[PDB]
Structures are given as structure tokens and as C-alpha cells.
């Protein structure tokens, strides 16, 4: 309920006036001016499911976190800071999963992107070397080569920061690192871009 209040302050529940057929299951109503609204319960269930997918991997440094959007850059360096995932902040360089001579080349087991139209090169390249992917998806998202969507508002900084903060909290809960049923010492403000 407290996290619901936080989701309401960040407005993580508002879409972008267009709807795809595969996101139709996550919609609840439509605002008059055309904006769509997500069912927040479904959003939380996708967050929990993604957390339960992340913890199967023994070493977290082989999870890739890719986010080209400036408004998310800060938020992705903190998700790693408490989970020990591997961040690819800026322009994704072609070849990073397919070309072994590259200096930042790697062979991860999960790709976690922020947006499916930004960061398209990572999503397309991961389909050549057997990586599944999880994406933060808005109402107009195209789910090609994506296995788990997360319905959410992926433009405003508060939304993005709170989303990565929730994900990292539930992962640290599931692994046993931080205690269950108790507010994390980390304020979500550390994830939002100033």
C-alpha cells in the first residue's frame, strides 16, 4: 500500500495515448484526453516475477543492465551497486555480444533493458547468442524478441528510479541479503535523476 502511494506520486501508471494489442491485458481504464492507465496490481506481479527470474543466476555479474536514456542513467548504476549486475550505460557499441575482439565484449545470461525502441541494438544482438531478455515496456511497446514485459511509465525520472528501486529491493529480499517485511535503508531518491 505504501509502494502503491509511491507509484501514485511518481505517476508510474500513465501511458502514452497509443496501445499495442499485446499490452491490452495490462490496461484498466482510459483517461478522457486519451492517456491509458495500467492496473498497478499486474505491474507489481510482473515485478515479482522478474525478481524470481533474476535470482536463479548464481553470479549476478553476468546479468547485463542496458539503458541508453539519460533520465535512467543514474538509476542503472545504483541497481548494480546493490545487486552486482553489469551496466552498459551509454551508446551500445555493435559487436559487444557477437565480436570477441571488442574490449568491452561479454557473454551474459540475462539482458535487462529499459526501453524497447531505445536500446534496440542490444535486443537485436542478443538474439544471435541465445540470451533471454526482460524489458521495461510502456503501452506502445513492440515485444519482438522480449520474454518478460513490465508495464510501466518509462519516461519520467521518478517512475524509472522507483521501478529499479523496487526491483533491487525484492531481489535483495529473495536472496536473504536484506530482511523481509522491513523498509530498506536505501531511499528511492538515490535512483532518481536530479
Amino acid at each position: 500500500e505504501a509502494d502503491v502511494k509511491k507509484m501514485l506520486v511518481a505517476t508510474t501508471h500513465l501511458g502514452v495515448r497509443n496501445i499495442d494489442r499485446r499490452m491490452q491485458f495490462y490496461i484498466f481504464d482510459r483517461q478522457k484526453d486519451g492517456t491509458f492507465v495500467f492496473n498497478l496490481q499486474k505491474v507489481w506481479a510482473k515485478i515479482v516475477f522478474a525478481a524470481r527470474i533474476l535470482v536463479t543466476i548464481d553470479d549476478p555479474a553476468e546479468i547485463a543492465v542496458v539503458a541508453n536514456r539519460p533520465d535512467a542513467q543514474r538509476a542503472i548504476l545504483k541497481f548494480c551497486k546493490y545487486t552486482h549486475a553489469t551496466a552498459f550505460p551509454g551508446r551500445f557499441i555493435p559487436g559487444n555480444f557477437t565480436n570477441r575482439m571488442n574490449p568491452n565484449y561479454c557473454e551474459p545470461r540475462l539482458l535487462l533493458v529499459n526501453d524497447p525502441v531505445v536500446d534496440r541494438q542490444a535486443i537485436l544482438e542478443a538474439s544471435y547468442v541465445n540470451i533471454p531478455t526482460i524489458s521495461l515496456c510502456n503501452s506502445d511497446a513492440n515485444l519482438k524478441f522480449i520474454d518478460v514485459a513490465i508495464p510501466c511509465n518509462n519516461k519520467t525520472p521518478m517512475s524509472i528510479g522507483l521501478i529499479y528501486w523496487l526491483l533491487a529491493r525484492e531481489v535483495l529480499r529473495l536472496k536473504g541479503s536484506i530482511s523481509r517485511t522491513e523498509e530498506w535503508d536505501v531511499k528511492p531518491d538515490l535512483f532518481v535523476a536530479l
Binding site: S127, N130, F145
Partner: protein, 82 residues
């Protein structure tokens, strides 16, 4: 089981994996197939070790993007959602 001899010996070189969503054989050279696994907590919000649940999805279903629906359906019916 695989193809068999006249006596009972399975004379099949190897057994390809089937898609968990479409029942299709995976086959080698298909570098768009993804096999991934899930926690199965069973203990008050913490996972336990070496007890997972695994599924397969071929490039044919990924290419158009039916996993976000099919894998949710599968996990609901294996007791991972509702």
C-alpha cells in the same frame, strides 16, 4: 524415446529439445532459442537452492513476440502467478 532398432536399442544420435510453448523441436543452429529457469520459493519469500522450473522457447515464437503471453500462461498454470 527416439527411433529404435529391431531389438529395442534407441539408435538416435541425440534428442532435440521441444519448445515449452509450441511443442516444436529446437534443433541446432537455432541461436534464438532461450532456456531459462525460475525460483520456486516454497519458503516465506526466500528461494531455496537447486530447485527450479525451466522452460524452452524457440526463435519462431520469439521473433514475433509471444513469450510475454505464453510464458505467463505457463507459469500461472505451474503455480507461479495468478
Amino acid at each position: 524415446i527416439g527411433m529404435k532398432n529391431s531389438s529395442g536399442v534407441v539408435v538416435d544420435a541425440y534428442i532435440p529439445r521441444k519448445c515449452s510453448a509450441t511443442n516444436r523441436l529446437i534443433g541446432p543452429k537455432d541461436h534464438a532459442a532461450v532456456q531459462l529457469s525460475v525460483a520456486r520459493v516454497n519458503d516465506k519469500g526466500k528461494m531455496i537452492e537447486n530447485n527450479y522450473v525451466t522452460f524452452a522457447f524457440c526463435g519462431a515464437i520469439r521473433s514475433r513476440g509471444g513469450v510475454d503471453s505464453a510464458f505467463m500462461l505457463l507459469a500461472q498454470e505451474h503455480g507461479l502467478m495468478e
